[PDB]
């Protein structure tokens, strides 16, 4: 009687979505036994069992619905309801996440067993169709994986194979949708960093970006799809740009904190070597981005801003070596190396890119226009400022450790 009417079903679905959304906003939902957390925990898990089973038992490829009713596909909605459940149990019932997976041995093994299902579902979604793929259901599978990924223990085998698989999906598949691509790379980094520094990764993305977008000089050979496959004309240009430089920032956040704690002190030698190795690797990252023909939005601003922040960390570093190097005779071949590349490869290409972007010149409320353009005129100078203040502490360094570091600089 009820199974015949499809509308009746997508009612009692929408109802369930409304209940779980209500539980997020206030610690409790609407009706009776909607305050007693025990009973809500009971039901959530009892709802979960069935919603999981529907999606399991019935895929989205068995539809006879068309676009209007695939916008509210009974499959799709049950994954959105999953997403909020997995979400909002971590908000409240983080203790009973074991009892929660006992409904579906420690927490991590159950995690993996439950992951594989969605993983394979997503993979079948993606691999099968190209033409009119489920953007939404693929994307919020990605979102459920993201939410739940954070319950794996970071040294567990299941975490390792997750990341391997994660990066492997990013390495293989085409997938023209950018918000989709955005979500994957986000998940990749969020997983990756709590195993190690994500720096070669940033390098790799920049080399592919450099490959795809082209180059400033209008004659440099670049193509490197080989690294990571989910990077496009459309995708990398506004998006993987902001994210790859976003992830560089979190590098230099850590590096600023490193140097603050180091200058407190005066163990040291390994930490300096580590910092310089970091900086050297991501100076290759900055190299590939600079050579790129970056568009003129937040993409260009966030490169130039992060070149400032690269140079500012290099300023804190050089001014650090001045305090201490007077006492011994310091600057090991580590720092000489770094300074060499920051002069030889980095600084002059900073100039050729900013000059190219400002060379690039191809209805306006007067007040708003004045406010906008004189805001946007700061960062070409803040880069020339930041470079010349590097050169300052390098001339200071040259004198106050007895090494002429201006023999490198042009």
């Amino acid at each position: 009687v009820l199974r015949s009417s499809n509308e009746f079903m997508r009612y009692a679905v929408n109802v369930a979505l409304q209940k779980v959304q209500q539980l997020k906003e206030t610690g409790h939902v609407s009706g009776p036994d909607g305050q007693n957390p025990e009973k809500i925990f009971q039901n959530l898990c009892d709802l979960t069992r069935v919603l999981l089973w529907r999606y399991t038992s019935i895929p989205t490829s068995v539809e006879e619905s068309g676009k209007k009713e695939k916008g509210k596909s009974i499959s799709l909605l049950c994954l959105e309801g999953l997403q909020k459940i997995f979400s909002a149990v971590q908000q409240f019932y983080q203790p009973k996440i074991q009892q929660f997976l006992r409904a579906l041995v420690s927490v991590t093994q159950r995690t993996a067993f439950q992951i594989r299902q969605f993983q394979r579902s997503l993979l079948n979604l993606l691999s099968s169709q190209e033409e009119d793929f489920n953007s939404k259901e693929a994307l919020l599978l990605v979102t459920v994986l993201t939410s739940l990924s954070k319950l794996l223990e970071p040294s567990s085998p299941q975490f390792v194979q997750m990341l391997s698989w994660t990066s492997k999906i990013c390495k293989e598949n085409s997938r023209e949708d950018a918000l989709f691509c955005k979500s994957l790379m986000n998940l990749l980094f969020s997983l990756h960093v709590s195993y190690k520094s994500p720096v070669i990764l940033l390098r790799d993305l920049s080399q592919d970006i450099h490959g795809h977008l082209g180059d400033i000089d209008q004659d440099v050979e670049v193509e490197k799809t080989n690294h990571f496959a989910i990077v496009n004309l459309r995708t990398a240009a506004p998006t993987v740009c902001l994210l790859v430089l976003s992830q560089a920032e979190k590098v230099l956040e850590e590096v600023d904190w490193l140097i603050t704690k180091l200058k407190g002190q005066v163990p040291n030698q390994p930490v300096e070597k580590a910092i310089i190795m970091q900086l050297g690797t991501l100076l290759t990252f900055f190299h590939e981005l600079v050579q790129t023909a970056l568009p003129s939005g937040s993409c260009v601003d966030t490169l130039l801003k992060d070149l400032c922040k690269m140079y500012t960390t290099l300023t804190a570093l050089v001014r650090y070596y001045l305090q201490v190097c007077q006492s011994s005779g310091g600057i090991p071949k580590n720092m000489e190396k770094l300074v060499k590349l920051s002069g030889s490869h980095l600084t002059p290409l900073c100039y050729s890119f900013i000059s190219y972007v400002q060379n690039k010149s191809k209805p306006a409320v007067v007040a708003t226009a004045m406010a906008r353009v004189l805001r946007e005129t700061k960062p070409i100078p803040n880069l020339i400022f930041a470079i010349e203040q590097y050169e300052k502490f390098l001339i200071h360094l040259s004198k106050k450790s007895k090494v002429s570091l201006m023999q490198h600089m042009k």
Partner: protein, 314 residues
């Protein structure tokens, strides 16, 4: 030359009356400090007193650096033995009190203490401060001049404790480098655990401190991660200190309760979830209490028409 272990204190009471330079007083007291190691504990306090009254015309940095570095080592060794308590608590205390009665007459003593216990850069705060340094500070909050200065340091440090560790626990690169030195909530709580042997001065500072953190970092952004979590975490702490404090010190748990009620009652001008959530777990652990504090809940009810509903309910 070697000092008669018996009357080393009496020898150090003689350089009290001679006029000396810095180098001279420094030499004599750093030897009197080498001598704490090779003694019974119960005679260290009066020796510390006769060091401080000498240090009044000599080195203060040195006197208090010595007492701190010594008890820091002591408490760490007591900890890893646990992994002589019922008297180790008498000494730490009697000392904090003996250094109190001096910073009372010697306002420069306090300033040198405080300078010594600056965060500044967070790398000095991961070699400086302690489970003993902090009982000492949270006694010091009783001096009228000094309350405020002290608290402000503790509070601001508290946050960094969350911010280092939070930014640290984002990253594996950082966890590789730093060998994780116990963090600042832990320390403050180990004070509270120590507290039992009833050095009841520290308590004024705790309670003062505790509502400072929640009143400071309360939910009001919520009617990010950066400006959210190390303020909630801070709030949690406030709450955490007081509840643990309330469990231990039967004397205080009248005026924890009133000081809560105060902030609960007339507001909902500002949000107060946190205070009710504490108020729960206070009364959940040992609600005999409100039988002793009955006048005060009586005169929370005389505002229970003006109070908004979600508050009144809970």
């Amino acid at each position: 030359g070697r000092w008669d272990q018996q009357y080393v204190i009496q020898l150090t009471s003689m350089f009290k009356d001679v006029p000396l330079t810095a180098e001279e007083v420094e030499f004599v007291v750093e030897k009197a400090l080498s001598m704490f190691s090779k003694m019974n504990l119960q005679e260290i306090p009066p020796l510390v007193y006769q060091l401080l009254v000498l240090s009044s015309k000599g080195s203060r940095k040195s006197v208090l650096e010595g007492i701190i570095a010594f008890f820091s080592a002591l408490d760490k060794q007591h900890n890893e033995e646990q992994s002589p308590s019922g008297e180790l608590r008498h000494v730490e205390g009697t000392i904090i009190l003996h250094i109190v009665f001096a910073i009372k007459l010697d306002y420069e003593l306090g300033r040198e203490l405080v300078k010594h216990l600056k965060v500044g850069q967070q790398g000095d705060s991961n070699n400086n401060l302690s489970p003993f340094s902090i009982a000492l500070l949270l006694s010091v909050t009783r001096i009228q001049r000094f309350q405020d200065q002290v608290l402000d340091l503790l509070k601001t440090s508290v946050v960094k404790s969350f911010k280092d560790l939070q930014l640290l626990q984002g990253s594996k690169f950082l966890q590789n480098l730093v060998p994780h030195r116990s963090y600042v909530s832990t320390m403050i709580l180990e004070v509270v655990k120590n507290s039992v042997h009833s050095w009841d001065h520290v308590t004024q500072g705790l309670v003062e401190l505790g509502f400072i953190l929640m009143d400071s970092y309360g939910p009001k952004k919520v009617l990010p991660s950066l400006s959210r979590m190390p303020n909630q975490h801070a709030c949690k702490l406030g709450a955490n200190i007081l509840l643990e404090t309330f469990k231990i010190h039967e004397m205080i748990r009248q005026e924890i309760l009133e000081q809560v009620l105060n902030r609960v009652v007339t507001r909902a001008s500002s949000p107060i979830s946190h205070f009710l959530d504490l108020l729960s777990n206070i009364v959940m652990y040992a609600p005999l209490v409100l039988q002793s504090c009955s006048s005060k809940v009586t005169e929370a009810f005389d505002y229970l028409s003006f109070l908004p509903l979600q508050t009144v309910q809970r």
